[PDB]
Design a protein around this ligand. Structure first.
Ligand code: SF4
Lengths: 73, 108, 106
């Protein structure tokens, strides 16, 4: 949405890159974090990133999402 | 090629490190690797060969679709079908591709 | 064989056909492209004069690929009376493509 918003993961997102669960399936739903970036353009030029919403959580752990997977607070 | 050999190695090493397997039709694996290599050459980074880009060079600098891409690193979803999860039916059981087969598809 | 279509032959071959059109957006160095190609070839024979089947190389014809915002490949696009009817992404099974063909006939 807008950079630096509190958002909740409200869809089944399974990640294999979480520090507490390195190289293992871990669902993210129900977690809360901040919108670090909304990837659409590099230097005013259009980009095809299909998970534009980057959310920073705790432990400096971050994940990319589709807009429909996350909700504002 | 030395680039193809470098690309080959990354695919083989990364597959093992992630518990993913190459396609049961290795000619498919061969196509992708070579496409990654061709992109490595002209663009700098091994930009995913199974997408269309409005701006290849900007795409290389956002790094999103730079192999291994964000989807494959976080969600293990690889749509070129280079890195297949065990449950996928197209997943063979090799994690190694002969240097020989990679040129065979370049001629084919 | 399934004929190929470019930037200059799009309007005619696709947008103006009186029969429903199934277009295969592909690329010479995309794995799954090699996989659907046979299926697209088999589906052509099966539905002669019932639907129009064409292949579009995204490298060769980047203007159309841009025009229809084709992002993932292979994509298979469906056209009825020059209207973009459907978008199926990836190495689609024959049955799924079959099921889509029926949805557009008489
Ligand atoms: S989809 Fe991602 S992981 Fe798979 S080949 Fe393309 S860039 Fe690599």
């Amino acid at each position: 949405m807008n950079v630096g918003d509190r958002v909740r993961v409200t869809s089944s997102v399974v990640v294999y890159h979480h520090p507490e669960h390195k190289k293992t399936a871990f669902d993210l739903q129900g977690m809360e974090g901040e919108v670090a970036a909304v990837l659409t353009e590099w230097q005013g030029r259009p980009i095809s990133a299909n998970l534009p919403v980057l959310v920073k959580f705790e432990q400096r752990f971050k994940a990319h999402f589709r807009p429909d997977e996350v909700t504002l607070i | 090629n030395k680039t193809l050999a470098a690309m080959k190695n990354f695919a083989e090493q990364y597959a093992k490190r992630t518990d993913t397997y190459f396609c049961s039709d290795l000619s498919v694996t061969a196509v992708v690797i070579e496409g990654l290599a061709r992109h490595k050459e002209e663009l700098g980074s091994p930009l995913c060969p199974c997408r269309h880009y409005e701006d290849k060079e900007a795409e290389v600098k956002n790094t999103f679709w730079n192999c291994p891409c964000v989807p494959m690193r976080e969600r293990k979803e690889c749509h070129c079908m280079l890195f297949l999860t065990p449950d996928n039916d197209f997943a063979g059981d090799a994690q190694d591709i002969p240097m020989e087969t990679l040129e065979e598809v370049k001629a084919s | 064989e399934v004929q190929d279509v470019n930037d200059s032959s799009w309007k005619e071959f696709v947008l103006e056909s009186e029969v429903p059109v199934m277009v295969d957006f592909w690329a010479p160095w995309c794995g799954p492209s090699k996989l659907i190609a046979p299926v697209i070839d088999e589906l052509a024979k099966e539905y002669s004069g019932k639907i129009a089947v064409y292949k579009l190389n995204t490298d060769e014809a980047p203007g159309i690929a841009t025009q229809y915002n084709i992002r993932s490949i292979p994509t298979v696009l469906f056209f009825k009376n020059g209207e973009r009817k459907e978008s199926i992404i990836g190495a689609v099974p024959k049955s799924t493509l079959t099921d889509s063909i029926e949805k557009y006939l008489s």
